[PDB]
Amino acid sequence: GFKQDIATLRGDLRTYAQDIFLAFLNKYPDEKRNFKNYVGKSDQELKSMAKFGDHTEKVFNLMMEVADRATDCVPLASDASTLVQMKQHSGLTTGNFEKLFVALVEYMRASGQSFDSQSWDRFGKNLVSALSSAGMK
Ligand code: HEM
Ligand SMILES: CC1=CCC(=C(C)C)CC1
């Protein structure tokens, strides 16, 4: 289920974080506008870059903590508020988070593995709802 999926992802988090984030940027090329320094790069070029591996892994370190603190795929309001307030997210709207979770769910569906993709899709929906509620447009 969802909790085991957190353990699976954490067991190889650098790899999953890069692969899911690349799935997100390739599915929604226009999202490269928030990361201007990733433009005109192949996947292998991005994985060679410092900011890419470090930043993507830090995103997923926190995403897994938010997942782990959730009840029935419903995140804490405090985790939602942190995500909205962060200076690094000043630009963003719920659509940015929408798209990241569509890509994550698709990645899980396509994987060889028994991910609980339905639980991640509900988690994404519930996080978008919590971000809206905490003041993201
Ligand atoms: C649950 C989802 C997400 C989590 C947990 C999360 C978490 C984080 C964390 C921890 C950082 C700081 C990392 C660092 O400075 O090394 C960060 C920065 C950032 N995040 Fe997010 N993030 C999420 C979703 C998004 C989405 C959907 C976008 C854009 C579409 C985004 C854009 C950014 C940007 C642009 C930065 C700063 C740019 C940079 O790294 O130089 N994040 N996020
Ligand atoms: C905070 C952050 C850092 C790195 C990212 C990558 C896509 C490498 C985006 C999110």
Coordinates of C-alpha atoms and ligand atoms in Angstrom, one line a residue:
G1 CA 0.0 0.0 0.0
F2 CA 0.9 3.7 0.5
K3 CA 3.1 3.2 3.6
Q4 CA 5.1 0.4 1.9
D5 CA 5.4 2.6 -1.2
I6 CA 7.1 5.3 1.0
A7 CA 9.6 2.6 2.2
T8 CA 10.2 1.4 -1.4
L9 CA 10.9 5.0 -2.7
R10 CA 13.1 5.8 0.3
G11 CA 15.2 2.6 -0.3
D12 CA 16.4 4.1 -3.7
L13 CA 15.3 7.7 -3.3
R14 CA 17.9 9.5 -5.4
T15 CA 17.1 7.3 -8.4
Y16 CA 13.2 7.5 -8.0
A17 CA 13.4 11.2 -7.4
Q18 CA 15.4 11.9 -10.6
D19 CA 13.3 9.5 -12.7
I20 CA 9.9 10.9 -11.5
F21 CA 11.1 14.5 -11.8
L22 CA 12.4 13.8 -15.3
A23 CA 9.0 12.2 -16.2
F24 CA 7.3 15.4 -14.9
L25 CA 9.6 17.8 -16.9
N26 CA 9.3 15.7 -20.1
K27 CA 5.5 15.3 -19.8
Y28 CA 5.1 19.1 -19.1
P29 CA 8.0 20.8 -20.9
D30 CA 6.6 24.3 -20.1
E31 CA 7.3 23.5 -16.3
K32 CA 11.1 23.9 -17.2
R33 CA 10.2 27.7 -17.0
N34 CA 10.4 27.4 -13.1
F35 CA 13.9 25.8 -13.6
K36 CA 15.5 27.9 -16.4
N37 CA 19.0 26.1 -15.8
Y38 CA 17.4 22.7 -16.9
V39 CA 16.4 24.0 -20.4
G40 CA 18.2 22.4 -23.5
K41 CA 19.5 19.5 -21.4
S42 CA 19.0 15.7 -22.1
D43 CA 18.0 13.5 -19.1
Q44 CA 21.7 12.3 -18.8
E45 CA 23.0 15.9 -18.8
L46 CA 20.5 16.9 -16.0
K47 CA 21.6 13.7 -13.9
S48 CA 25.3 14.8 -14.2
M49 CA 24.5 18.3 -12.8
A50 CA 24.9 19.1 -9.0
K51 CA 21.8 21.3 -8.4
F52 CA 19.7 18.7 -10.2
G53 CA 20.5 15.6 -8.1
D54 CA 20.7 17.5 -4.8
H55 CA 17.5 19.7 -5.3
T56 CA 15.3 16.8 -6.7
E57 CA 16.4 14.5 -3.8
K58 CA 15.6 17.3 -1.3
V59 CA 12.1 17.7 -2.9
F60 CA 11.4 13.9 -2.5
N61 CA 13.0 13.7 1.0
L62 CA 10.3 16.2 2.1
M63 CA 7.6 14.7 -0.1
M64 CA 8.1 11.3 1.6
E65 CA 7.9 13.0 5.1
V66 CA 4.6 14.7 4.1
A67 CA 3.4 11.3 2.8
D68 CA 4.5 9.6 6.0
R69 CA 2.8 12.2 8.2
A70 CA -0.5 11.8 6.3
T71 CA -3.6 9.9 7.5
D72 CA -5.4 8.0 4.8
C73 CA -3.5 10.0 2.1
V74 CA -4.6 13.3 3.7
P75 CA -1.5 15.5 4.5
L76 CA -1.1 17.6 7.6
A77 CA -2.3 21.2 7.2
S78 CA 1.0 22.3 8.7
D79 CA 2.9 20.5 5.9
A80 CA 0.6 22.2 3.3
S81 CA 1.3 25.7 4.9
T82 CA 5.1 25.0 4.9
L83 CA 5.0 24.1 1.1
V84 CA 2.9 27.3 0.3
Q85 CA 5.1 29.7 2.5
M86 CA 8.5 28.4 1.2
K87 CA 10.3 31.4 -0.6
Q88 CA 11.3 28.9 -3.3
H89 CA 7.6 28.3 -4.2
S90 CA 6.6 32.0 -4.3
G91 CA 6.1 31.6 -8.1
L92 CA 3.9 28.5 -8.1
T93 CA 0.2 27.6 -8.4
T94 CA -1.7 24.3 -7.6
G95 CA -1.4 23.3 -11.3
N96 CA 2.4 22.9 -10.9
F97 CA 1.7 20.4 -8.0
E98 CA -1.2 18.8 -10.1
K99 CA 1.2 18.0 -12.9
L100 CA 4.0 16.6 -10.7
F101 CA 1.5 14.1 -9.2
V102 CA 0.0 13.2 -12.6
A103 CA 3.6 12.3 -13.7
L104 CA 4.3 10.4 -10.5
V105 CA 1.1 8.3 -10.8
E106 CA 1.8 7.6 -14.5
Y107 CA 5.4 6.6 -13.6
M108 CA 4.1 4.2 -10.9
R109 CA 1.4 2.7 -13.3
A110 CA 4.2 2.1 -16.0
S111 CA 6.7 0.6 -13.5
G112 CA 7.1 -3.1 -13.2
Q113 CA 6.1 -2.7 -9.5
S114 CA 3.0 -3.1 -7.1
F115 CA 2.9 0.6 -6.2
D116 CA -0.6 1.7 -4.8
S117 CA -1.0 4.2 -7.7
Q118 CA -4.6 5.0 -6.6
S119 CA -3.4 6.1 -3.1
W120 CA -0.7 8.3 -4.7
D121 CA -3.4 9.9 -7.0
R122 CA -5.6 10.6 -3.9
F123 CA -2.5 11.9 -2.0
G124 CA -1.8 14.3 -4.9
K125 CA -5.5 15.5 -5.1
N126 CA -5.6 15.9 -1.2
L127 CA -2.3 17.8 -1.2
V128 CA -3.5 20.2 -4.0
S129 CA -6.8 20.7 -1.9
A130 CA -4.6 21.4 1.2
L131 CA -2.3 23.8 -0.7
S132 CA -5.5 25.7 -2.1
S133 CA -6.8 25.8 1.6
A134 CA -3.5 27.1 2.9
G135 CA -3.5 30.0 0.2
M136 CA -1.8 28.9 -3.1
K137 CA -3.7 30.2 -6.2
Ligands
HEM1 C1 5.2 17.7 -2.7 C2 5.8 18.4 -3.6 C3 7.1 19.2 -3.4 C4 7.9 19.3 -2.4 C5 8.0 18.3 -1.2 C6 8.9 20.3 -2.6 C7 10.0 20.6 -1.8 C8 11.0 21.5 -2.1 C9 12.2 21.6 -1.4 C10 12.6 20.9 -0.1 C11 12.9 22.6 -2.0 C12 14.2 23.1 -1.5 C13 15.3 22.2 -2.1 C14 16.7 22.9 -2.2 O1 16.8 24.2 -2.1 O2 17.7 22.2 -2.4 C15 12.1 23.1 -3.1 C16 12.5 24.1 -3.9 C17 11.9 24.4 -5.1 N1 10.7 23.8 -5.5 FE1 9.7 22.5 -4.6 N2 8.6 20.9 -3.8 C18 7.5 20.3 -4.3 C19 6.9 20.6 -5.5 C20 7.3 21.6 -6.4 C21 6.8 21.8 -7.7 C22 5.6 21.1 -8.3 C23 7.5 22.8 -8.3 C24 7.4 23.5 -9.6 C25 6.6 23.1 -10.6 C26 8.5 23.2 -7.4 C27 9.5 24.1 -7.6 C28 10.5 24.3 -6.7 C29 11.5 25.3 -7.1 C30 11.5 26.2 -8.4 C31 12.4 25.3 -6.1 C32 13.6 26.2 -6.1 C33 14.5 26.2 -7.4 C34 15.8 25.7 -7.1 O3 15.9 24.5 -6.6 O4 16.8 26.4 -7.3 N3 8.4 22.4 -6.2 N4 11.0 22.4 -3.1
LIG2 C1 13.7 22.6 -5.1 C2 14.0 21.9 -6.3 C3 15.2 21.7 -6.7 C4 15.6 20.8 -7.8 C5 14.6 20.5 -8.7 C6 14.9 19.8 -9.7 C7 14.0 19.4 -10.7 C8 16.3 19.3 -9.9 C9 13.3 21.2 -8.5 C10 12.8 21.5 -7.2

